[PDB]
Structure 1
Amino acid sequence: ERIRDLTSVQGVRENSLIGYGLVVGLDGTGDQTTQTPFTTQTLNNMLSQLGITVPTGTNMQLKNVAAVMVTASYPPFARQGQTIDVVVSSMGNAKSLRGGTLLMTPLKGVDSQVYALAQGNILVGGVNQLNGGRITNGAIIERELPTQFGAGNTINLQLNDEDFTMAQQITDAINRARGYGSATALDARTVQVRVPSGNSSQVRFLADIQNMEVNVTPQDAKVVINSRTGSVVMNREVTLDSCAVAQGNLSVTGGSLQSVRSSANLNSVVRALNALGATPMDLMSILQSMQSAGCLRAKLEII
């Protein structure tokens, strides 16, 4: 059950759907409608569609209606009649969408075609975000996408992370499990697999391939630094080289220059860095300086 966790099947992908709607039933926490003319304009549009023509010159000050944007994911092999979850986000000067209801909303694709219709009740946590909510099974699929699955005798497994070693390992595992020339590698990210012609046979082949177990070879050493959240993460391949480190208000537990020993595994690296007595914000600067000097034998990525 590792191949399904390391790769994705070519043609089996997700799309993004967007749409505009109105959320009603709020407890006076909707749009002001004086700074958001589109709310009243679209409410008048809906009323006109339903058979009510409000005169153009009239002041409408609503409190229970909010103009919202609805986002959804079009799943692979989606069929009409199926339901998907949607996210509803306020667009202007609304205060809360706690007990609102989303009216009929057409969800358009990139090609500006309706692929789903959204309508349901919003669930809002209520420190919690008030202007955003989620509706489970809130949209019904209305259009279906053609696909080439089942045509041809080749399917590509696309690795989540590029690696020649992992691509070769997956290819060798498939060849060890299902014949000599069952899988070949095209690059560091794509493995081409030969499958029998048809739909059911390819589904069977993919079902056998997906749950296969592949031992993950060691990746590249990498230290991920998030300055916006104040976090540091080091994987198991990080090593250290011996060198001296000095930083403000940090001293030997003594002098301001502290030795850092040569470290081979991650436990040694953690011990050496904890001997410094550094706050993670200080550890960020220490790690960047050590990468500049050359002690840190890892790829420092700031995210």
Structure 2
Amino acid sequence: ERIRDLTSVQGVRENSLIGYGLVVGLDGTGDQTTQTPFTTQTLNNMLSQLGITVPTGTNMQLKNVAAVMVTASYPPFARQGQTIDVVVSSMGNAKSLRGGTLLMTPLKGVDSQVYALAQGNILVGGVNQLNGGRITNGAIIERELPTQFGAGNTINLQLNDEDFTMAQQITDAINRARGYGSATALDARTVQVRVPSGNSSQVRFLADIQNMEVNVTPQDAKVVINSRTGSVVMNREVTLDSCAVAQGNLSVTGGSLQSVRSSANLNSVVRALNALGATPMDLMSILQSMQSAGCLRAKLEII
């Protein structure tokens, strides 16, 4: 059950759908409608569609209606009649969408075609975000996408992370499990697999391939630094080289220059860095300086 966790099947992908709607039933926490003319304009549009023509010159000050944007994911092999979850986000000067209801909303694709229709009740946590909510099974699929699955005798497994070693390992595992020339590698990210012609046979082949177990070879050493959240993460391949480190208000537990020993595994690296007595914000600067000097034998990525 590792191949399904390391790769994705070519043609089996997700799309993004967007749409505009109105959320009603709020407890006076909707749009002001004086700074958001589109709310009243679209409410008048809906009323006109339903058979009510409000005169153009009239002041409408609503409190229970909010103009919202609805986002959804079009799943692979989606069929009409199926339901998907949607996210509803306020667009202007609304206060809350706690007990609102989303009216009929057409969800358009990138090609500006309706692929789903959204309508349901919003669930809002209520420190919690008030202007955003989620509706489970809130949209029904209305259009279906053609696909080439089942045509041809080749399917590509696309690795989540590029690696020649992992691509070769997956290819060798498939060849060890299902014949000599069952899988070949095209690059560091794509493995081409030969499958029998048809739909059911390819589904069977993919079902056998997906749950296969592949031992993950060691990746590249990498230290991920998030300055916006104040976090540091080091994987198991990080090593250290011996060198001296000095930083403000940090001293030997003594002098301001502290030795850092040569470290081979991650436990040694953690011990050496904890001997410094550094706050993670200080550890960020220490790690960047050590990468500049050359002690840190890892790829420092700031995210």
Identity among equivalent positions (%) equals 100
Secondary structure class of the residue paired with 1:220: coil
- Once the two structures are TM-superposed, the CA of residue 238 in structure 1 deviates from its matched residue by 0.0
Counterpart Cα distance in 2 of 1:221 and 1:182: 32
Counterpart Cα distance in 1 of 2:39 and 2:127: 27
CA deviation digits over 1:74-97, x for unaligned, max 9? Answer: 000000000000000000000000
- Once the two structures are TM-superposed, the CA of residue 222 in structure 1 deviates from its matched residue by 0.0
CA deviation digits over 1:254-296, x for unaligned, max 9? Answer: 0000000000000000000000000000000000000000000
CA deviation digits over 1:188-221, x for unaligned, max 9? Answer: 0000000000000000000000000000000000
Runs of 4+ that moved beyond 4 A: none
Counterpart Cα distance in 2 of 1:116 and 1:109: 9
What is the Cα-based RMSD across aligned positions, in Å?
0.0
- Once the two structures are TM-superposed, the CA of residue 140 in structure 1 deviates from its matched residue by 0.0
Aligned residue in 2 for 1:132: 132
The gaps in structure 2 that reach 5 residues or longer are none
Counterpart Cα distance in 2 of 1:256 and 1:295: 18
Counterpart Cα distance in 1 of 2:15 and 2:4: 20
The gaps in structure 1 that reach 5 residues or longer are none
Secondary structure class of the residue paired with 2:157: strand
Counterpart Cα distance in 1 of 2:270 and 2:115: 51
- Once the two structures are TM-superposed, the CA of residue 100 in structure 1 deviates from its matched residue by 0.0
Secondary structure class of the residue paired with 1:158: strand
Counterpart Cα distance in 1 of 2:126 and 2:38: 27
- Once the two structures are TM-superposed, the CA of residue 18 in structure 1 deviates from its matched residue by 0.0
Counterpart Cα distance in 2 of 1:27 and 1:234: 48
Q: Given the two structures, how large is their TM-score scaled by the length of structure 1?
A: 1.00
Secondary structure class of the residue paired with 2:69: strand
Aligned residue in 1 for 2:69: 69
Counterpart Cα distance in 1 of 2:35 and 2:278: 50
CA deviation digits over 1:59-118, x for unaligned, max 9? Answer: 000000000000000000000000000000000000000000000000000000000000
Secondary structure class of the residue paired with 1:188: coil
**Residues 1:159 and 2:168 aligned together:** no
Aligned residues: 303
- Once the two structures are TM-superposed, the CA of residue 42 in structure 1 deviates from its matched residue by 0.0
Aligned residue in 1 for 2:178: 178
Q: Given the two structures, how large is their TM-score scaled by the length of structure 2?
A: 1.00
- Once the two structures are TM-superposed, the CA of residue 163 in structure 1 deviates from its matched residue by 0.0
- Once the two structures are TM-superposed, the CA of residue 165 in structure 1 deviates from its matched residue by 0.0
- 1:216-227 alignment runs, 5 A limit: 216-227=216-227
Counterpart Cα distance in 2 of 1:195 and 1:267: 45
- Once the two structures are TM-superposed, the CA of residue 129 in structure 1 deviates from its matched residue by 0.0
- Once the two structures are TM-superposed, the CA of residue 227 in structure 1 deviates from its matched residue by 0.0
